[PDB]
Ligand binder design. Sequence first.
Ligand SMILES: O[C@H](COc1ccc(C2CCCCC2)cc1)CN1CCN(c2ccccn2)CC1
Ligand SMILES: O[C@H](COc1ccc(C2CCCCC2)cc1)CN1CCN(c2ccccn2)CC1
Lengths: 57, 273, 273, 236, 59, 59, 255, 40, 40, 40
Amino acid sequence: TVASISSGPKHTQKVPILTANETGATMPVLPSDSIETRTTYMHFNGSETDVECFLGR
Amino acid sequence: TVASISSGPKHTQKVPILTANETGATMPVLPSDSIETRTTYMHFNGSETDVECFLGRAACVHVTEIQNKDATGIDNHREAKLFNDWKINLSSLVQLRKKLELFTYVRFDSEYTILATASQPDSANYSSNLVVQAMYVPPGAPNPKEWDDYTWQSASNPSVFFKVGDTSRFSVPYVGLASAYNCFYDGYSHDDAETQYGITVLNHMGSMAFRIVNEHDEHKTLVKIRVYHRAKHVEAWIPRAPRALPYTSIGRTNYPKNTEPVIKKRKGDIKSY
Amino acid sequence: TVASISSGPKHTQKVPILTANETGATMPVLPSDSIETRTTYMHFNGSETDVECFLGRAACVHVTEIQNKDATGIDNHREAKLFNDWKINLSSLVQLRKKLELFTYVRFDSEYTILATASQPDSANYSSNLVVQAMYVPPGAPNPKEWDDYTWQSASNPSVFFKVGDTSRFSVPYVGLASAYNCFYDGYSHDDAETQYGITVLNHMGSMAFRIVNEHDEHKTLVKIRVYHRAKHVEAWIPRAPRALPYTSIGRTNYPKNTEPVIKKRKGDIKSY
Amino acid sequence: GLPTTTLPGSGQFLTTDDRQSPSALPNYEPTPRIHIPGKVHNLLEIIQVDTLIPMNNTHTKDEVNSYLIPLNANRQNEQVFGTNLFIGDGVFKTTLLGEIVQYYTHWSGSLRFSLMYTGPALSSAKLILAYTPPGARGPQDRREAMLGTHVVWDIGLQSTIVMTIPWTSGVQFRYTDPDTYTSAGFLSCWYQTSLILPPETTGQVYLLSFISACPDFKLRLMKDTQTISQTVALTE
Amino acid sequence: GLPTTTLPGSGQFLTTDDRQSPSALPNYEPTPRIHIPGKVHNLLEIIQVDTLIPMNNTH
Amino acid sequence: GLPTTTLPGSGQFLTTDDRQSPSALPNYEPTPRIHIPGKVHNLLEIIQVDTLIPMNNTH
Amino acid sequence: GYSDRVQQITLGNSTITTQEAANAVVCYAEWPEYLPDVDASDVNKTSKPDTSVCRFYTLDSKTWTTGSKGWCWKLPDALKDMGVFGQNMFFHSLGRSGYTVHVQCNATKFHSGCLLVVVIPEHQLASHEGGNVSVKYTFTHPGERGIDLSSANEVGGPVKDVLYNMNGTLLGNLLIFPHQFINLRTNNTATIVIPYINSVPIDSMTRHNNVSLMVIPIAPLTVPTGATPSLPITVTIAPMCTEFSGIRSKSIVPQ
Amino acid sequence: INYYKDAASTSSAGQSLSMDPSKFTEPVKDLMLKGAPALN
Amino acid sequence: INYYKDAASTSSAGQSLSMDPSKFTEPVKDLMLKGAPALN
Amino acid sequence: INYYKDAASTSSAGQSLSMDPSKFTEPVKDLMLKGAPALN
Ligand SMILES: O[C@H](COc1ccc(C2CCCCC2)cc1)CN1CCN(c2ccccn2)CC1
Ligand SMILES: O[C@H](COc1ccc(C2CCCCC2)cc1)CN1CCN(c2ccccn2)CC1
């Protein structure tokens, strides 16, 4: 799984960082929408935040 | 496997025993390069020198003590040893410490065994049966303040309850923040002019709190806790020179002043046997 | 299997019962060589005379004793039996010793069982519950000096913790330096004019240290340790004459002076029944 | 309900046993491993790297000088140094080899002893190193020394000489803590001809000496080292 | 009778262990589940919804 | 957790029983065996060698 | 006619030639390489100035005399002020690098003396005070000057006792670390290639030094008769495969 | 191996490995594409 | 048989049986052959 | 079933069922046949 993909300079008409929060959504913006990133992998599953785990001790 | 091959007289232009140590290598010279040998087999694998084996037996890492007594009128439970904590480390007691510091970075799972025995140094009718409670108060979690705080509810924090005289045992995954634990760290936590140096900064793992669950009987009971630690699934990188001088502090390399010569002086000459 | 075959009258030139013992042989003569026999079967295998069976049951090899008491002001823990050691041997108690010395070289794995019971010879309110600590201090390792030395950390040395009244048990591979243990050794450790003779020199295996982990209660408690040893995976070479006279020392063959006749004198003649 | 019987040893804690345990942190995900140069797998890997021996032990406080074996120009027939081979004690004891051997009870195998010469390049020398197998005394003169394992070393362009103490033994293991029956011999070194310094040069020259184990080597039965102890627990 | 040995840790209660237990109510039948909008499975699902920060903390 | 019941005899030490035990020296390698003439396997092997009888016991 | 003896290292816009080498050591048998994605954590693209940072900087020279005890430099500290390497260093949040170290000392065939040149990963120093006294920042960040083991104890500084490696271990065992000797009679330089060694993929270049380079006289310098009794030792070091990441404002560090 | 008959007596459940924040993070009626204008 | 779910809870690891001293004993850049001259 | 890893930890060995007294009862160099004269 990639945690971040590689992304480079941008000069577009397509701006993912401008939104309208009045709508009630949290738009899924990522580091790679606003800086230049390199690939990295997650190495993690989110196992210990499962509700079974959270309420299970 | 052969430990030595058979080899006979030599009169060559090819001399394996002359080398240049300035290069930094240790050339793999064998008995058969300089005497006449006969075949012999190894009969041995080097099993018990594997690092998993070397670091894999339980070592005592900590001895603490708590007492069961009437807390009535005690203004500071922590101070009365009504309960106690351990700013968890593996470099307090030194037998295991010298072993680990043969390496720079080490990564492993731990298996803990906790033995608790009771003492009744002054007149008691009997020996009571106490249950010990040990809690892990990570960095940012509430620390117990009294021996019976809400903290001990430990609703999200792993805790084990066992009886004095018995032993408790479980195992923890490798909980280091980086890829390995640093046995050494030549750095600071930030570029501060007075911040502390060492590993004391890096190895931030919280304390393990112990208490007796029992209320008090008429006499007082001393319970002494011994924590044993066994590394399992060991991985070690970069060997270093063994520790020669005595240790003075958890986490610093410092040795004591006016220490004694560590190399044994000859009783005789260089020429002596 | 037949134990005896059927055999009838004989009038031969072939006499199996006349031999020459000067040769060193024991000729395999049977009932059927000299009387008339009938067939009978063995019905038996000789199972319980196998050397694995003969040396394979636990035998008491050592009884020692340690006490739990206030060490305050004790200048010599070892001497107060605050802790104790055993210069490990298998030739202290003699029931097992005579059995082993039927052979010259012996090789086997050992299974130890350690029973610890407590005694309170003088007025106590109760019986405390003590945990015993036994450590193996090989030749060159630190020996305990006090009952709570760094030694007891035992970070590299196998140690077992069990409760008084209980038993502890584990098994050790064959730890001899040679291919077998010498039951006898007609040699010295070097050609010295005054060095000791025997096996006392060869059989160098270190001591096993015992202590109570508990601090002291108001009364004193005597704990007496019994070590049992069972050979498993036995291999024995070269049978010898059984021991006739009493033993005097661990590791020497010496018998006591003015000992008594070991052969029972007849009450009567050679002719007596 | 299945019928069981418990045996002697139940409830004991043996620091050397290896069993499963419940994890206190169910479901936790450890940090990924990244690559780090230098991984060690066996202590046998590291005791083959050679390290310096403080052979010149004759000082009174630890000094850089006890690593230096001095050599005198123009001496003939004489002896450069001597030592027994109790690798767990004496000169050997603080070396990495000595230091690891001390974690085990028994050792067997060949040792590699080398000498690197540091005198001016325009000097010359011929030394003899001799290994004396157990059973005889430390040699007292080269004649005595030369009848056992030896190497005539000719000091040249090639700066180091590697002598091997081949495993000579009845019993297949020796004790690391010094023991008689189990003793390994002596190592001595003498002038074969003599050190000669070029003009305009003077004084003592020194040899550095190293020790490491051959691939031959075996160590067994782990135990605690006499090389470290303590009187109270340390704190931060 | 099968021979056993008990290890260190026997009888301990670790609040984080996960094992089977006898049911006190043998054979009881729980109420059927009906559908309810909003099921959460991971705390990671909810920390992606944004909420307001009291940035102006100065009161 | 599997349900068990312990029988009479639990915890006893019978010097003649034969069971497994943990090794105190995990991973240790014993010295190789070499050949030695004279191996004995059964006491029945040796009681077939004859030895002298002090028949004249009258001393 | 290639000898182990003559060598040329060209890195960036700078070249070194030695006519009296003794092979070269590559720590742990690994050559410096960039940070692979599979090992990456920070999502930032990194900056690889290449030839402007991966060239040879020659630190100021030392003087070996008969009384010398040895010198110690820390990396990347020693280079904190060299050209654009240094700027990059103070300006990014994180950086990573390997190095080629070339230590130089020539004499004549009448001199004797032997230096140990060793690289110690994570060399945590000891306070000469004992106990749990710390070693202040400035003291472990000497810069190009390095630490002079024959200088006096100072307050808040490390201990400078050579038989103990500045940490409670014996000089004799430093040979377990990648190292090479300079024996006037053999050798005139020492070269060690250092791969990046850390427990994290990239780190801060200012709060943590990841190797100390140490040059220690072991067989004392002995000059020919009526020669001047000293020789200079020069250290030239080149960052290799350097990467910087997390650019911003420019760190301010004590003193 | 379950040793017991009832389902309540079994150990903890096993990870949902379900995970779908959109019911919480994007409950909008007309779908919003990142990059397209929020309000048209 | 593992009785437990997590990997940390398993027993000790099993012998590397890896063993390669050359990273420590021969980290030289140009390969040295035993028997050939050290410095050419 | 061995529960333990090391060989020393296994139970007792099992009967040699070897049994050959001739090394002890007839170690003579030239073979003696029962019934034939001992000394010829
Ligand atoms: O073993 C320790 C595990 O930390 C915990 C975590 C949880 C608990 C709880 C779990 C629930 C039961 C109570 C204890 C105890 C210790 C980690 N340990 C920290 C110290 N560390 C090192 C490494 C290098 C140098 C010094 N120490 C070695 C690794
Ligand atoms: O059984 C002994 C094993 O030695 C140990 C080793 C370790 C321990 C420790 C292991 C960890 C637990 C504590 C005990 C105890 C004894 C060896 N034993 C030595 C004596 N030996 C012989 C042989 C012939 C004649 C006399 N004795 C028979 C064999």
